[PDB]
Amino acid sequence: GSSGSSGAGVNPYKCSQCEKSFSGKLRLLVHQRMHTREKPSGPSSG
Numbered sequence: 842g843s844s845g846s847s848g849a850g851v852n853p854y855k856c857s858q859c860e861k862s863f864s865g866k867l868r869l870l871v872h873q874r875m876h877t878r879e880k881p882s883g884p885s886s887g
C-alpha cells in the first residue's frame with residue numbers, strides 16, 4: 842500500500858530505466874534497449 846496516489850498512471854508495463862510506460866509488453870522491451878551502453882562513454886559518477 843502507498844499513502845498518497847495522485848495521477849498514478851495505469852499501464853501494464855513500466856520502463857524500469859526511466860519513468861516510461863507502455864500498454865504493450867513489446868513496446869517496453871524495444872524501448873528499454875535505448876538504455877544500453879556498449880562502450881564506457883563517461884567515467885563513473887553519482
Ligand SMILES: [Zn+2]
Nearest residue numbers: 856858859861
Ligand atoms: Zn526507458
